[PDB]
């Protein structure tokens, strides 16, 4: 789910920030051989405050 | 927490306490995070 931060700054910045907390992998397998692989994995768990 | 309590009222009232105190506060925490990681590369771990 998207945390966001809503700094709404009239002149000129309007913050509608957001960024989800959410379990995630992002992996980058890279295959070797023997069924092997060396990955570039982002294991994140957030969670809303 | 600590009064010690003399009083004569009877007589004349004439208070007379001793009031101490003394805490004793222990706290450790030991926490220990393992990280696998690439030769020559960084990797995090981040609990917080």
Known sequence: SEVPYQ???????TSTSFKEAALSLEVTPQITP???????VKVTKDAPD | ????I???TDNIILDL???AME??????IV???????SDKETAKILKG
């Open chain 1, 7 to 13: 700094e709404a700054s009239s002149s000129g910045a």
């Open chain 1, 34 to 40: 023997d069924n092997r692989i060396i990955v570039e």
């Open chain 2, 1 to 4: 927490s600590g009064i010690g």
């Open chain 2, 6 to 8: 003399g009083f004569i």
């Open chain 2, 17 to 19: 306490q001793l009031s």
């Open chain 2, 23 to 28: 805490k004793t506060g222990n706290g450790e």
């Open chain 2, 31 to 37: 926490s220990q995070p393992k990280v696998v990681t």
